[PDB]
Each structure stands twice: as structure tokens, then as C-alpha cells.
User: Fold this.
Amino acid sequence: DNINEDIQLLTDFEVQPKCVGQPGIFHLNMRYRPPVRGARINVNMAPALFDNC
Amino acid sequence: AQDALSDGFVRLCIDPSLNFFGEGCKILVEGQMTDDGSATPDAVTCVTSELDIIERFGQGSVLTESLRKVFCTCKSGVSVYALPREDAAAGVKAVYTLTIAGPATTDGRVQLYMGEAEYAVDIGVDAGDTATDIAAAIVAAISPDFPYAATAAAGVITLTARNAGTIGNHLSVIYTNLGSCTSVTPEGVTVTFAQTTAGSVNPTPNDYATVVNECCFAVYVLSSDDTDWQENLRDWIRSAWDCSKPQCFGHGYVFNKGTLGQVLADGDNSAELSRLALPTTYPVLPYLTNAAYGALSACSTCNNPELNIQGQTFGLLSCINMPESCTPGWTFGEVTQLQANGFVVSGPSTTSGQGNYTSPYIYNDVTNYLRDEKNRPNATFRDASSRRLAAATGVALAEFLQQFNGLAVFTKNTNIRTGIIGTNPRLMLGKIRKWAQDNVGTLFSEFDNINEDIQLLTDFEVQPKCVGQPGIFHLNMRYRPPVRGARINVNMAPALFDNC
Assistant:
């Protein structure tokens, strides 16, 4: 949808309070869309027999 | 030595003084601990992480569970302090009897919401299982962290509170499987919940002055329903907010579970406590919700003191999960009566009959403060934001004024020469006004008149002639703090006509 807003990387400094976050710790949030299984295909056949309608 | 350092022309020092960690979120969780724990009672101890909770404060104790909720709530907090308490000498453990009758004739699932959603059990009952087998299965499925030791006896499950006192009197087992369309409860099996004995004598420590002498705590969480113990904590935090000695502020978080009359009677004019009004039919163990609320408030203090722990976004106790119901705990009449009398009301995030779990969120983030020392109904400390933010403002102004400590003070006409560590009341007031104007939109609102709102007087123009002492100043600051934001009365007026 938006790879820029789906994957975010923050340091531990911008997640934890002031002077509490530790250096070298990162927080990666990834909002991805995996393939789905595919459960049912509801097919609705509608035979058309008329030519002038 | 090492080349370029051996001749002593370059002398090198490392100075690792910048990179020291700040404390963090100073929340003191107080509650009873079981004798299985290794912690020393009546002593404030740092709790580093959720790992040592069971070892230190007992397995399934009240303090263990409240600390588990405090750790689930805040981000990665390690500055959680605990204050373990011993059970009263003559304390009586509450005993509930979950009696099961059968036998089951059809298969099914037996789901039970005991305590919180973390403790729920979900067993599979087959056809022909006697009540004994079902009780044994439920006991074997009861989580060990559940603050109730479960023993099966001929189909009756005796749940004995791990901690003596009245704190065990708030267990609500809900057979959240009846009438379910998805999970079909077995035919036969009948779950009944009775409480054969009540909790009794509670701890009344009253030793905060000694245990927490000057070790300040932004948030005190009390995991007891005893109003005497809550009153002792209230008196302590009130002393912490006292002009007499140097204030190092705090704010207490207690709950009051009962009927509307009982909850309102348990309240007083305590600006120091944020009383959490819980209905009699409250499913979650109350100290868990109280601990989540206090932990959220603390975890805000660390970041944004002006934030109000309120609403589905900022006051959402996502760790707590209670089953959804159409009966809304407090009716809106009771909600208005509680919010009127300075009580924090909490409600389900979603209402439904589908029987999911919902996280309670805080309706109003207020203290139990309604009226002044003249009883003069006042609004200074109505909000928990107000206490948190008055503390933050006092500390920020004090840390700013500390820069005038040590400086020699000249008269307000002297133009201090350069290189002289000195100042005069005029420069002091100018710097204070600049500080206050720097905190507009961060700590105050704007200033009606910053010149007439912030005044600095020497002790000579306050005291009588030749009575004032040199070097003593009186600073009056009339600021406007951010307000909480309680209600938005929206009045929709649809207009359908074009020629009117």
C-alpha cells in the first residue's frame, strides 16, 4: 500500500523516555500483506438465451 | 606508553560522564506478597524486569500480578519499584467454591473467565466425564500465576486466595461459554460459584515515612482495597506535597469497588489519589486494573506530563481484558454521579453480546479532589494531569532557579562586570520571564500579561524595615496550565430546507 509508511525503523532513543533508551537498539515495524489461501470461488452462471432482450 | 602519548605533549582523558542512564519511570507498586517470595517485606526494592517477579514477590501473589500488569503496560520500563507487604498475622484467605455437577452427556468445551483473561481456562469435556474428571481438568488448566490456589475435591474446586486479607474478596469466575454459538458447552455440566469464606484482617503498614523517606516516586500504585491503607498512602502523598518541607511530589492510584453509595462514601477530598470507581460486578481483579492505570499514568509522566490518561487511545488499559457484556457495569446515571464526585470511571472499549474480550479504557483522568481548604469547590487539582503537571512545572522552575544559586546578588541597579559570577534581581526576573515565555505551549498556555503574572521581590520590600534578610527573594508566578478536556457537547442541527 505504502512501503514508506508500512516499514518504519526507530532507534531506542525515539521510543524510550529521555536518557532511558539504550544505544544500538532498533525497533522495526513492518505491516506487510501476505498471500491468502483462497477458500472458495462462488461462481454464478447465468445462461442468456434471448437475442432481442 | 603509546606513540604520540609517551612524550607527554598530549595528555588524554576519556571522561565517560555523559553516558549514564536516567532512572526512567519511578512507579512504586505496593501490595501483599506470598511467603514463597524472596523479597524482604516493608522495603522499597527496584524491580529490573518481569523475570524475577515470581522469585522475589511470590508465585501468584497480589504484588506479583500487579507488577506483571505494570510491566505489560509500560514500554520497556525497568525503574519499576515494588514495596512488598506481609499478610496480616490473623489474616484470613478468601475461599471460593466452584462446584461442578454432571456427568456430561455430550462433548463440548468448558471455558471459564476467572480473574483476568490471562487466567482463563478452556478445557475439553467428553461425554460421560464425571464432575470429578471435569474438576480435575479445570484445576490442571488453572494458570499458576492465578492468585488463587485451586484444589479439586469430588467435583468441587476450592480456590483459596494466595494472600490473606480483603484483597481476596474480588474474584469473579464467569462461565463464558453458556449459550455460545461457536464453542458449544457440554450438556450436563453445571458450573456454580459461591465464595464459602470471606477475607479478613488486612495489612496497615503506616510506615511510609520510614520506608519511603525522601526517595520520591512519581506514581504510587496501591493493590489493596482497604480504605485505611489507602488513607495512609493518601496522608503520605499529601505530606509529599507539603510546603513545610521540600516537596518531592507524587500521585496515588487506588481503587474503590462497590455499590455507588459505597464507592461514593469511600471517597474524600484527596487530590493525592486518583480513585478508580469499580462496580460490584467488576469481573477483572481490581488491583490489576488499578496497576494498569497507574502504570499508564507513570509511563506518560516519563514522556508527557500534560497528557490525560483518558479515552480509547491514551487511557486504554490494553493489558486488561474483560468479557464484553450489554450490562454496562455503572449505568450512565452512576457514571455521572461518580465523575461528579471526583472518581475515575473506566469502561469497556467495545460493547457487544458476541462475548469477546474488551480492554477497559479510562473515561476521566481526574483526582479525587473537589474542593479547597475552604471547601470552596475548586478546580486546581481536579485533573491527574494537574497534579502531574504542577509537579513538572515546580521541578522545572526549581531547576531553572538553581542557576542563580551561588551567584552573588547585586542591587538591581548594578551592571555586573564581565567575569564576575553575579546577578541582580532585575536580571533574575528577566531570565525567569524568558524561561516562562519559553515554556508557553509546552508547560503553560499563553500569558495574559507576563509582566504582571511573574513578579520578583526582594525580602526587603516584603518584610518590615530592617527585618528582611539579604539574599532572600519572593517569586510569584500566576500561570495558566493546560486543562484536561472533559466533554464536547456537540449539537447537530440538520438543515433540510433551501428557501428558509
The longest helix of chain A spans residues 3-6. Chain A touches chain B at residues 15-20, 22 (CB under 8 Å). The beta strands of chain A are 7-11, 26-30.
